[PDB]
């Protein structure tokens, strides 16, 4: 299968520089025009960079021209975006994208994206606290459990349960911004028979602080 | 610079019912070669955008017959006949006839369904957080429709909103319900001066509230 995996994201000061990367696989990289397309907080999309298959010709909108440089290493199946003189407007989720080869001028594959946050604030790892019933009557057909993730910056974080094995019933609320820090909570409901009959675990990822964490949901 | 304009900005429709998304362009999207480079992308909650339709009416491999695009010049529409639950997300039209390539700002396709009551769960703070000098009380409203809901907190009978943060999941792709959590964050010291902690939810699709509570002296 074709995939595109971006990295490089993180937090950076006004006027600073960052280099994003994109590892490509499952197709002949050499034969395809690549691009970066960014999605702003307000959820709008903007094409920021295009490079041809052999990497000879480039294009940029007026918004970023002079400041952004797209390049590709065809030997190492890798696409780059060099960024400079960062404005706050540049804050966005940055997607690495492939163009079709039939010159119908569309994007046929997008990665998961990496996030650029342009601010004076500081990268800060989350704390994770278990959400566990108590001090009240908790009985019967099911048990709802969770993780509360506080005090992180920039976004995003990801929460998984049992390294992905527990997908069903899981609810993960949007993150909320308060006094410069984000928080969220993830919850899963399961049969009362199965907890604490097994050990239940939440998996918390915060890439910008290169943080990965595991919490086991015990009782009492 | 081609302004692409979509309406409606939000679209709710019921399962099996059809929906219609309009996309209008500042200028004509017919290239000097007669081809019209107008595409549609759907972006589901927490994913990249993925192509649905390219050049007005051509379904990308994988895309069912439910979806179809139509129109010319400056006026284009996308239609979804038996709207399924998995179809919710943000539909974007894009043109690449003129440089710079541009996107419409998107149309949120919400699902419509019968009203549904929250299962409410309330959570005392963890001893971990307590040890660090903090105390977040969480109240979780699971599986409800519509989106709108107020939750409030009462400490020893008396109301609180300072230090309260509310947050919703995206509409579920299977059940089309929503969930949300409200979090009251105190200091451990303030948490320990009171016994009774209560969250109360209302929404305007009930004339009553739903209440869930615990007592600290009962831990």
**Pairing assessment for the beta strands B210-215 and B196-202 based on DSSP bridges:** antiparallel
User: Looking up tokens 């995206």, which residue turns up?
Assistant: B170
Domain count, chain B: 2
B4 touches B21 (CB < 8 A): no
Reading the block at residue B118, the tokens are 């929250």
* Residues A6 and A112 both lie in one domain: yes
Residues B108 and B123 in one domain: no
Domain containing A31 equals: 1-121
User: Which contiguous run of DSSP H or E holds residue B191?
Assistant: helix B188-191
Same domain, B85 and B151: no
* Chain B interface disruption, residue of A148, A178, A219, most B CBs within 10 A: A148
Among A43, A62, A108, beta carbon nearest to B51? A108
DSSP A62-81: TTTTTTEEEEEETTTTEEEE
> For residue A115, which residues of chain B lie inside 8 Å, CB to CB?
none
Q: Which of B25, B65, B59, B95 is nearest to A106 (CA)?
A: B95
Beta carbons of A135 and B219 less than 8 Å apart: yes
Phi and psi angles of residue A54, each rounded to the nearest 5 degrees, phi first: -85, -5
State which of B63, B92, B113 marks the end of a domain.
B113
| A126 touches B at CB < 8 Å | no
CA-based nearest residue to A34, from A18, A48, A19? A48
Question: Residue B91 in contact with residue B21, Cβ under 8 Å?
Answer: yes
Structure's resolution in angstroms: 2.4
Domain's final residue, options A104, A121, A138 = A121
Task: For CA atoms B94, A77, A117, A48, give the dihedral sign.
Answer: negative
Distance (Å) of CA B64 to CA B22, B69, B118: 20, 12, 34
Per-residue burial over A100-116, b if 16 or more Cβ lie within 10 Å, else e, is: beeeebbbbbbbebbbb
* A100 contacts B54? CB cut-off 8 A: yes
Inter-chain CB proximity A129 and B122 less than 8 Å: no
List alpha helices for chain A, DSSP H: none
| Residue B83 three-state SS | coil
A136 interfacial to chain B (CB closer than 8 Å): yes
Same domain, A205 and A110: no
Give the pairing type, strands B119-123 and A107-110: unpaired
Structure tokens at A107: 């994007």
In whole angstroms, give the CA distance from residue A30 to residue A76.
10
Q: Which residues contact A116 (CB under 8 A, 6 or more apart)?
A: A9, A10, A12, A18, A20, A38, A83, A86, A90, A91, A92, A93, A94
Closest alpha carbon to A39 in B92, B188, B59: B92
Q: φ, ψ for residue B210 (rounded to 5)?
A: -115, 130
Distance in angstroms (rounded) separating the CA atoms of residues B12 and A92: 27
> Look-up: residue for tokens 């993780």?
A147
**Same-domain pairing of A197 and A104:** no
Same domain for A7 and A57: yes
Q: Secondary structure of chain B: what % helix, strand, coil (to 5)?
A: 5, 50, 40
Rounded Cα distance between A72 and A115, Å, is 20
Containing structural domain, residue B207: 114-216
Angle, CA A197 vertex, CA A192 and CA A203 arms, to 5° = 90
Domain count, chain A: 2
State which residue of chain B sits closest to A133, comparing Cα positions: B123
Q: Using the CB atoms, write b or e for A145-175: b if 16+ within 10 Å.
A: bbbbbbbbbbbbbebbbeeeebeebbbbbeb
CB B126 to CB A113 under 8 A? no
The pair of structure tokens assigned to B128 is 């971990």
Q: Are residues B15 and B71 in the same domain?
A: yes
* Cβ neighbours of B219 (radius 10 Å): 10
A43/B90 Cβ within 8 A: yes
| Residue at which a domain ends, from A121, A138, A163 | A121
Same domain, B52 and B26: yes
């Amino acid at each position: 299968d074709v995939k595109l995996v971006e990295s490089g994201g993180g937090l950076v000061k006004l006027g600073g520089s960052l280099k994003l990367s994109c590892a490509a696989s499952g197709f002949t990289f050499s034969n395809y025009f690549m691009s970066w397309v960014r999605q702003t907080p307000e959820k709008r999309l903007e094409l920021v960079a295009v490079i041809t298959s052999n990497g000879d010709n480039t294009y940029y909108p007026d918004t970023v021209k002079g400041r952004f440089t797209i390049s590709r290493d065809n030997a190492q199946n890798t696409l780059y975006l060099q960024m400079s003189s960062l404005k706050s407007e540049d804050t966005a989720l940055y997607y690495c994208a492939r163009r079709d080869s039939s010159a119908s001028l569309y994007f046929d594959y997008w990665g998961q994206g990496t996030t650029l946050t342009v601010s004076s604030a500081t990268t800060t790892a989350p704390s994770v606290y278990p959400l566990v019933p108590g001090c009240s009557d908790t009985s019967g057909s099911s048990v709802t459990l969770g993780c509360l993730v506080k005090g992180y910056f920039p976004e995003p974080v990801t929460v998984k349960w049992n390294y992905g094995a527990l997908s069903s019933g899981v609810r993960t609320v949007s993150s909320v911004l308060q006094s410069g820090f984000y928080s969220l909570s993830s919850l899963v409901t399961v049969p009362s028979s199965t907890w604490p009959s097994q050990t239940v675990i939440c998996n918390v990822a915060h890439p910008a602080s290169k943080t990965e964490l595991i919490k086991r949901i015990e009782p009492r | 610079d081609v302004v692409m304009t979509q309406t409606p900005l939000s679209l709710p429709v019921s399962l099996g019912d059809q929906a219609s998304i309009s996309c209008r362009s500042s200028q004509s999207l017919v290239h000097s070669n007669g081809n019209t480079y107008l595409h549609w992308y759907l972006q589901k909650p927490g994913q990249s955008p993925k192509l649905l339709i390219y050049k007005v009416a051509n379904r990308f491999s994988g895309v069912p017959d439910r979806f179809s695009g139509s129109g010319s010049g400056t006026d284009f529409t996308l239609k979804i006949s038996r709207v399924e639950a998995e179809d919710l997300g943000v539909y974007f039209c894009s043109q690449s006839t003129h440089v710079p390539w541009t996107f419409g700002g998107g149309t949120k396709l919400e699902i419509k369904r019968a009203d549904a009551a929250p299962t409410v769960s309330i959570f005392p703070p963890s001893s971990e957080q307590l040890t660090s000098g903090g105390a977040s009380v969480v109240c979780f409203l699971n599986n409800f429709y519509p989106k709108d809901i107020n939750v409030k907190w009462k400490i020893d009978g008396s109301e609180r909103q300072n230090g309260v943060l509310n947050s919703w999941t995206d509409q579920d792709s299977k059940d089309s319900t929503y969930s949300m959590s409200s979090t009251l964050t105190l200091t451990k010291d303030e948490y320990e001066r009171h016994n009774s902690y209560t969250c109360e939810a209302t929404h305007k699709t009930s004339t009553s509230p739903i209440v869930k509570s615990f007592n600290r002296n009962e831990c």
